[PDB]
Design a protein around this ligand. Sequence first.
Ligand SMILES: CC[C@H](C)CCCCCCCCCCCCC(=O)O
Length: 283
Amino acid sequence: MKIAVMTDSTSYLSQDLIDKYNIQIAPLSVTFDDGKNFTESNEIAIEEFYNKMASSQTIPTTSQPAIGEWITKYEMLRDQGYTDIIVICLSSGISGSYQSSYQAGEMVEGVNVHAFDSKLAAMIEGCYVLRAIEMVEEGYEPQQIIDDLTNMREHTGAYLIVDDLKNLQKSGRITGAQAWVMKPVLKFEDGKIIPEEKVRTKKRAIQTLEKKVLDIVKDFEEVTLFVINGDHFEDGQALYKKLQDDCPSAYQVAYSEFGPVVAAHLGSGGLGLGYVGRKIRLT
Ligand SMILES: CC[C@H](C)CCCCCCCCCCCCC(=O)O
């Protein structure tokens, strides 16, 4: 038994971790209104993406990995001698990437695929990859890893804000906000993005993100927090610095950013605060 762990590009793992653990990536893509298509990778300079998105009369659209891209990746890992593949996917609530990876796993011969619906995105999704790789090294079997990740998902969540709900509304990735067709605070709930509160200022929304999350993770035996920032540098920097001041060092507090595919749906000003009830290995 040789177990591989792979994921899609929206887990936004650093190239260092991808290189070190040889993590295969099924990439998602972005398509701009001038017909220019782009595949997600760390090669992309993210400020260049925000610039083109701001200079687009029409919001760009995104694509999940086609089912054939999952298949090709599964066959490559099988043909390298892997018998089992753990697949960490973007939330099934916002993308078909998981169901495609699931269906692709049924269709590929000679290797066992264990697709996992992270029910989130970005480096919070990435944390499931890093937990899976850690357990593989420790000798666990695929069902034990899927069981552990499922328990991890019960103590994992995220809150977030955006400058303008237009991008989420255009793509249909905000649920239950038909009345809004003030500053909204959103959260993930069973893999979908819903409104949580509405505050008067952006600064109060950022303080609200911290309070919501700290109130939750206070009861966890292990805590990892991720500040995941968009195109406004000082917003993520302000939240990250304040968390380092307000949290004990027993909390793991990390920083990351949104890639093009997620940025296309949030628009400018996206800022997330995510939590995992585990001490995830980030090295
Ligand atoms: C701290 C964690 C953060 C709060 C996470 C925020 C994630 C926001 C996701 C926006 C929606 C992306 C849909 C991509 C669909 C891709 C497709 O299938 O086309």
